[PDB]
């Protein structure tokens, strides 16, 4: 829903934060 204006950060999928 782009108009919500709360996009998720482009870490898709979550990966090992290392």
């Amino acid at each position, epitope marked *: *829903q*782009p*108009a*919500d204006g709360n*996009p*998720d*950060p*482009n870490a*898709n999928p*979550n990966v090992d934060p290392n």
Partner: antibody, heavy 125, light 114 residues
Framework: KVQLQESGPGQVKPSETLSLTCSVS????????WSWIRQTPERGLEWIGY???????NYNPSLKSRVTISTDTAKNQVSLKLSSVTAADTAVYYC???????????????????WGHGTTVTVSS | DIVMTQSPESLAVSLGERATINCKSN????????????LVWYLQKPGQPPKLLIY???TRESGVPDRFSGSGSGTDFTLTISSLQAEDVAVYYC?????????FGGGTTVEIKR
């Protein structure tokens, strides 16, 4: 293919909590977005909410207070809990795999690409 | 919430004729940053879940026959079936995937006149 399969109890009694599971094949619940939808003759199709690949949940305000959506990455499953059910919650319930669009460093969903077969839930005493 | 309204609620045309279904929203579905309309079309046959036909208003999903096309922009959208086939009888739904909560039209029943 992608295949989603909902499991549910058939009937639930008034004021109990409905628990449903969506088993996912051919896709990972760690990716993109996963919605729950329900359908009745009178109301048509109603979106309940989704969960994103970050764990962020987004619920319909018509239901927010009573709904939880979660994922189990180990089992590659999506779940729905709906508390304090009434007859108004009788419906066919579907889980969906929703695709993502990420114009530049951030994503949102744009389509319910694959739906499960559905599970029929009747709330009755 | 965005309200989605379909017209007609039912239609029937002869085999091979054109069928059109209209869907209107009460808020533009055009996202200026991508210049796409966040409108989806599904069909549903009995005992089956809805199946995806068209997204971003006019992009056809893979495996869908060529006779299905979507058009429109802003608040007024149309699904066209250029040549209705017997297997196409179903309830057709539009959906906005633009602003939460996501919302659906009420469906249009498409039938064959034989």
């Amino acid at each position: 293919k992608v295949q989603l399969q909902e499991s549910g109890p058939g009937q639930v009694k008034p004021s109990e909590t409905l628990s449903l599971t969506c088993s996912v094949s051919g896709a990972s619940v760690t990716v993109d977005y996963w919605s729950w939808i329900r359908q009745t003759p009178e109301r048509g199709l109603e979106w309940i909410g989704y969960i994103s690949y970050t764990g962020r949940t987004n619920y319909n305000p018509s239901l927010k207070s009573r709904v939880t959506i979660s994922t189990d990455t180990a089992k590659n499953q999506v779940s729905l809990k709906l508390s304090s059910v009434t007859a108004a919650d009788t419906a066919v319930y579907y889980c969906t795999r929703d695709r993502s669009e990420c114009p530049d460093g951030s994503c949102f969903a744009y389509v319910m690409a694959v739906w499960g077969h559905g599970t029929t839930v009747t709330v009755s005493s | 919430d965005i309200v989605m309204t379909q017209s007609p609620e039912s239609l029937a045309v002869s085999l091979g004729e054109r069928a059109t279904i209209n869907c209107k929203s009460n808020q533009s579905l055009l996202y200026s940053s991508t210049n796409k309309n966040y409108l989806v079309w599904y069909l549903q046959k009995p005992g089956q879940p809805p199946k995806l036909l068209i997204y971003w208003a006019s992009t056809r999903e893979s495996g869908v026959p060529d006779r299905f096309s979507g058009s429109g922009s802003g608040t007024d959208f149309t699904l066209t079936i250029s040549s209705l086939q017997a297997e196409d009888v179903a309830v057709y739904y539009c959906q906005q995937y633009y602003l939460s909560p996501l919302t659906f039209g009420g469906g249009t029943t498409v039938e064959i006149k034989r």
